[PDB]
Symmetry: C4
Subunit: 92 residues, 4 copies
């Protein structure tokens, strides 16, 4: 029972939905490719493509500053939840 995790999850999903909508409508990517671009951008993995429109470039700059902190907060909380069963099985 972790409302902090639940809220971070919601915020992450909503942020990825917004990017998917944006890149699929403004940059003309298939939904899966718009989601992929959004994910590799906010996780800092990085893309092998870039936006073609000035609007898309500006959006991506702002999207990084809006979303990078949240995404890494979520990744951290996710890691705690995913590794804890193994830690506890190896402890008590």
């Amino acid at each position: 029972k972790d409302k902090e995790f639940q809220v971070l999850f919601v915020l992450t999903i909503l942020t990825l939905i917004s990017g998917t909508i944006f890149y699929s409508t403004v940059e003309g990517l298939r939904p899966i490719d718009a989601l992929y671009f959004s994910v590799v951008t906010l996780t800092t993995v990085g893309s092998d493509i870039s936006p073609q429109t000035d609007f898309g470039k500006i959006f991506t700059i702002l999207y990084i500053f809006i979303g990078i902190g949240l995404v890494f907060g979520f990744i951290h909380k996710l890691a705690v939840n995913v590794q804890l069963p193994s830690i506890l099985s190896n402890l008590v």
Copy 2:
């Protein structure tokens, strides 16, 4: 204005991004918007789909990376703790 460290990191981040925009548009021939995009994705460690083509560009980018990552991520951290986190919390209050 309450957190002076945040104020400094913000100004330094803006100046760093202006410097990169000027550099890449002059030396690497990018349009200013593409030079700003390149600077942002580089200093946040996202990475661009392109890379510098000139030796000057490569050397500058190495130095810009080392100095710039620390500042931009210091700014992102302060933005998260001083702006985004309080805004999220406020927006979760039932009214």
Copy 3:
């Protein structure tokens, strides 16, 4: 063996990298060494020069990123504090 959290993160990291090696060599057709390279650069956030071409590959990679980054960086942190830092310190002692 003294730090059980480090032990768990190490094993989980190895299993995660084996899973990626198997996945990318089967679904994306990469040689195993290229699948391992891709998995490593992806989960450390370095990023590859390539990207998945199949929709299965794209979906898997999104999930692998979210689960894998946290584990691999947990491992890197533990490796730094429990192995690399004590080794550096020991190697700086005049004898």
Copy 4:
């Protein structure tokens, strides 16, 4: 006077030298491009190329695990030293 910073600097330079030597001899890159590859790898910015030899791929995997922590420790210490004059000029 910061021996911690001095040591991190030395370790970083030696690590970048080793990568420059490796990628310029094994992967046939010009020195500047071997240094660039080493830097964007350890800082996690990422490269638009990859090693062509199996030896180079294996080396890069190990190089990441050997060097990423040190490089980020250095980047942090560098940031403290670079921003402190501005903070202090804005304070005392």
